[PDB]
Amino acid sequence: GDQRFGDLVFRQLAPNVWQHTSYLDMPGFGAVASNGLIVRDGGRVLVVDTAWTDDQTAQILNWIKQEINLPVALAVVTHAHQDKMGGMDALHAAGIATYANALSNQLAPQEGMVAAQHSLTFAANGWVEPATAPNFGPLKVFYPGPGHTSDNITVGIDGTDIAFGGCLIKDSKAKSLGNLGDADTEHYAASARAFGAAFPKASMIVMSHSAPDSRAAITHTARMADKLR
Ligand SMILES: O=c1cc(CP(=O)(O)O)c2c(F)cc(F)cc2o1
Ligand SMILES: [Zn+2]
Ligand SMILES: [Zn+2]
C-alpha cells in the first residue's frame, strides 16, 4: 500500500484521499515521521500540512503532478511547528494559495516559520468562519481548543469517513502525548474530545505521527490527557 517516492511515503486512504509522510532527524532522538493529507476535489487538489522542509514539500507537489496531474488549489496548515509549516516557501514558490489559523500566522516568525498567505478565524464554537476558508470543498476546518499547541486546528473530509487531528491526536496504543513544549496541558483532554465530537462520522482518524487509527485514538489520547490535569 505504501508508495516510497524519494525520501517520502504516500498511502491512499480513500478514492480521493492520500496521506503524505516525511521524515526529519531530531538529533539524538531519531528520524521523526510526520503525516499530512492530499485530497482530490473534482479537478483540483487540496493539501493539508506541508512536509518538514521546502525540498520535501516540493517533492509532495512532484508526486501530485505524477500521480494526480491536477492543480493544487490551496493548502491549509494545522499549526506553527516545522512538521506542519516548514515547507511554506515551497507552496508559495509553486503559486499555491495558503491558509492557517490566524494565530498560527502570528506565531510563525518566532517559530522560524513563514506565515501562510491567508488567515482562518473561528467562531466561538470552534468552526471556521466560512468566509475565511473559501473554496475549501470537502475540507471542514475545526478549532477544538488548545491542546498540543494553542493554535492547533483539525480537518474533516466531507463525503469520507476521515478526520485529521494533526499533532493533537496520538494513536490508540501511544505511550505519551509527545512534544508538550507548547501545549496547554489543562485543556488538552477537552480539546481532544471536542475534535471527536466535531466529526462523529469519522471512523478513520489520521494524525501527525502514527498510521491512521480507529476512534480509539481519540478516546485514548483524551484519557492520557486527563492525567495532565
Ligand atoms: O519530535 C519532535 C517533533 C516536534 C514537532 P511537533 O511538536 O509539531 O510534533 C518537536 C518540536 F516542534 C519541538 C521540540 F522541542 C521537539 C520536537 O520533537
Ligand atoms: Zn507541533
Ligand atoms: Zn507533532
The best mutation among 26, 107, 170, 171 to test binding of ligand 1, ranked by most ligand atoms within 8 Å of the C-beta, falls on 26
Between β-strands 3-5 and 72-77, what pairing exists: parallel, antiparallel or unpaired?
A: unpaired
Strand order, beta sheet including 154-157:
139-142, 154-157, 162-164, 204-206
> Quick one: cell of 68?
494526480
Cα 101 versus chain centre, distance:
12
DSSP result, 72-97: EEEEEE-SSSHHHHTTHHHHHHTT-E
Contact 44, 71 (CB under 8 A): yes
Contact 228, 185 (CB under 8 A): yes
**CA end-to-end distance (rounded Å), the chain:** 40
Method: X-ray
Between β-strands 72-77 and 97-101, what pairing exists: parallel, antiparallel or unpaired?
A: parallel
The best mutation among 52, 53, 78, 83 to test binding of ligand 1, ranked by most ligand atoms within 8 Å of the C-beta, falls on 83
| Cα gap 63→6, rounded to integer Å | 10
What secondary structure, in 3-state letters, does 161-219 show?
CEEECHHHCCCCCCCCCCCCCCCCCCCHHHHHHHHHHHCCCCCEEECCCCCCECCHHHH
Query: Domains in the chain and their CATH numbers?
Result: 2-227 (3.60.15.10)
42 C-alpha vs ligand 1 centroid, how far in Å?
34
Q: Name residues contacting ligand 1 (CB within 6 A).
A: 26, 32, 81-83, 167, 178-179, 181, 208
| Cα gap 151→85, rounded to integer Å | 13
